Amino acid sequence: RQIVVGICSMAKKSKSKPMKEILERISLFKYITVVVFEEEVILNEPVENWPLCDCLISFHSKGFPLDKAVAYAKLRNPFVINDLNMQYLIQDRREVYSILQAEGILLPRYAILNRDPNNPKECNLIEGEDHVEVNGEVFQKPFVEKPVSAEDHNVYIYYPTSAGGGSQRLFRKIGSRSSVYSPESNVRKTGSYIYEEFMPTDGTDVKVYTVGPDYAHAEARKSPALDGKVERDSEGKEVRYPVILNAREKLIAWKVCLAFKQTVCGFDLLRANGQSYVCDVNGFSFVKNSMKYYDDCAKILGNIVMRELAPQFHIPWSIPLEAED
Ligand SMILES: O=P(O)(O)O[C@@H]1[C@@H](OCc2ccccc2)[C@H](OP(=O)(O)O)[C@@H](OP(=O)(O)O)[C@@H](OCc2ccccc2)[C@H]1OP(=O)(O)O
Ligand SMILES: Nc1ncnc2c1ncn2[C@@H]1O[C@H](COP(=O)(O)OP(=O)(O)NP(=O)(O)O)[C@@H](O)[C@H]1O
Ligand SMILES: [Mg+2]
Ligand SMILES: [Mg+2]
Ligand SMILES: [Mg+2]
């Protein structure tokens, strides 16, 4: 019998072009059958009625019942590609940063401001014109202010007086824009935030996409900290710039993939001051518009499934070679 790979995510993800590109390729594996769980089933059926699988690829996005996925994995005990419980922690930037620190991964100097919504003024924040003090720790402008919820993309950057003051307000892309300037120079007064040092890059962010700990694709985009206008080619796709990871960065990718237990993992790197700093870990994420990524990702995922489960199924399997980039 076939080894069944189950895909469990919201339909927007399960029917996305990159998902479909990868699944058609995984399906080329002789002994693998792919089953995509229907969103209506995920949302409305108890987990006892969900399809069986031997290997589970499942990940959280908006509206996804992560508690049900975890209960399904508990019930059926499949081989899990991206750990489900870690996906609760990935929603909280404080937990992400704590894991990165515990792994010796360079990240911006930071402090957490936890604010009681009942007594918002009592928290340990002192604000000057050109700096803040968070639990006594000083951040000179420019600094970054991130909501503790990793799903809240309202990240603000505060400029020093020497550069005109005010702030850049980033947000989930709305059309041709990913940020805007604001004359406001004072920090937000409601909510809990991570404050961190601004790392000077060349104006680009590096996005890294792992498929297991030994393969990572990287590419760069214009930072929204810049001016907020999204760069587009004549075709209307967002401009992306080529990146090859250095030896240190390839190790970063290995560590992030393993520490978060996300085989398929996206994260952000800031190249600054001759080092590379992780500033965000997003979990499950596919590269778009690269035929070579689709090929490599599907092959790697298929080989992981076979290596783990071929002996159980008495299917003969010799471990092949695999790419890094
Ligand atoms: O609801 P918001 O937190 O504000 O943002 C959603 C995106 O969901 C982010 C999210 C929220 C909760 C958990 C994980 C991820 C969601 O991402 P995904 O998790 O579905 O990938 C995003 O879609 P995409 O990544 O495809 O751009 C938007 O969802 C629109 C939406 C749909 C249904 C109800 C509300 C909102 C977007 O909504 P708006 O455009 O109205 O802000
Ligand atoms: N410490 C920093 N120094 C300089 N730039 C930063 C810093 N932190 C964040 N940024 C910039 O601000 C952007 C958004 O911050 P990030 O921590 O990536 O938030 P996000 O909202 O989780 N993004 P994503 O989940 O990738 O959609 C980054 O891509 C960088 O361009
Ligand atoms: Mg097949
Ligand atoms: Mg990011
Ligand atoms: Mg993020």
For residue 15, give the ligand nearest its CA: 1
Output DSSP code: residue 130: S
Q: Which atom of ligand 1 is nearest to the CA of 152?
A: 3
CB of 281 closer than 6 angstroms to any ligand 2 atom: no
Q: Which atom of ligand 2 is nearest to the CA of 223?
A: 31
Q: Which chain residues have CB less than 5 Å from ligand 3, an ion?
A: 27, 32
Q: Is 207 helix (H, G, I), strand (E, B) or coil?
A: strand
Output the known binding site for ATP.
Answer: 93, 146, 153, 172, 196-199, 205-207, 223, 268, 280-282
Report whether 300 contacts 191 (CB < 8 A): no
Backbone φ and ψ for 232, nearest 5 degrees, come out as -125, 145
Query: Taking the CA of residue 314 as centre, how many other CA atoms within 13 Å lie in the half-sphere pointing to its CB?
Result: 1
Output the known binding site.
Answer: 12-13, 93, 146, 153, 172-173, 196-199, 205-207, 221, 223, 268, 280-282, 285-288
CATH code of the domain made up of 84-285: 3.30.470.20
The structure tokens 């001051």 sit at: 273
Q: What token pair was written down for 253? A: 């990718």
DSSP strands (E only) in the chain: 3-8, 32-36, 55-58, 79-80, 110-113, 125-127, 131-134, 137-140, 143-147, 156-158, 167-174, 177-182, 193-197, 204-211, 216-222, 241-242, 264-272, 275-283
CA 100 remoteness from chain centre: 13
Q: Is 43 helix (H, G, I), strand (E, B) or coil?
A: helix
**Structure resolution in Å?**
1.9
The structure tokens 């996906």 sit at: 87
Output DSSP code: residue 161: G
Query: 262 forms bridges with which residues in the sheet?
Result: 82
Amino acid at 170: L
Q: How far is the CA of 27 from the centre of ligand 3 (A)?
A: 4
Cα–Cα dist 120/191, whole Å: 8
Output the known binding site for substrate.
Answer: 12-13, 172-173, 207, 221, 285-288
The structure tokens 């499950």 sit at: 284
Q: What token pair was written down for 119? A: 């007594």
Q: Which atom of ligand 2 is nearest to the CA of 110?
A: 1
Q: Which atom of ligand 2 is nearest to the CA of 280?
A: 17
CATH code of the domain made up of 1-83+286-325: 3.40.50.11950
Cα–Cα dist 263/142, whole Å: 35
Cα–Cα dist 127/133, whole Å: 6
Residue nearest (by alpha carbon) to ligand 2 atom 31: 223
- Please indicate the experimental technique that yielded this structure: X-ray
The closest of 179, 192, 227, 205 to 282, measured between CA atoms, is 205
Residue length, the chain? 325
Q: What token pair was written down for 175? A: 């059309």
Spell out a b/e string for 45-81, using b for 16 or more CB atoms within 10 Å of the CB, else e. Answer: eebeebeebbbbbbbbeeebbbebbbbbbeebebbbb
Cα–Cα dist 10/3, whole Å: 23
Q: Is 98 helix (H, G, I), strand (E, B) or coil?
A: helix
Distances (CA, A) of 144 to 194, 203, 246, 282: 8, 15, 26, 18
Pairing assessment for the beta strands 3-8 and 55-58 based on DSSP bridges:
parallel
Q: What token pair was written down for 56? A: 């589970």
The closest of 15, 49, 56, 13 to 34, measured between CA atoms, is 56
Report whether 277 contacts 257 (CB < 8 A): no
Output DSSP code: residue 237: P
Q: How far is the CA of 311 from the centre of ligand 5 (A)?
A: 38
Q: How many CB atoms lie within 10 A of CB 266?
A: 20
Q: How far is the CA of 91 from the centre of ligand 1 (A)?
A: 14
Cα–Cα dist 232/234, whole Å: 7
Q: Reduced to 3 DSSP states, what percent helix, strand and coil does the chain have, rounded to the nearest 5?
A: 25, 30, 45
Q: Which residue ranges make up each domain of the chain?
A: 1-83+286-325, 84-285
Q: How far is the CA of 318 from the centre of ligand 1 (A)?
A: 42
Cα–Cα dist 160/141, whole Å: 5
Residue nearest (by alpha carbon) to ligand 1 atom 23: 62
Cα–Cα dist 244/122, whole Å: 46
Pairing assessment for the beta strands 125-127 and 79-80 based on DSSP bridges:
unpaired
Q: What token pair was written down for 316? A: 């003969």
Report whether 208 contacts 300 (CB < 8 A): no
Please, what is the Cα angle at 86 between 169 and 260, to 5 degrees? 80
The closest of 211, 218, 213 to 300, measured between CA atoms, is 211
DSSP strands (E only) in 15-107: 32-36, 55-58, 79-80
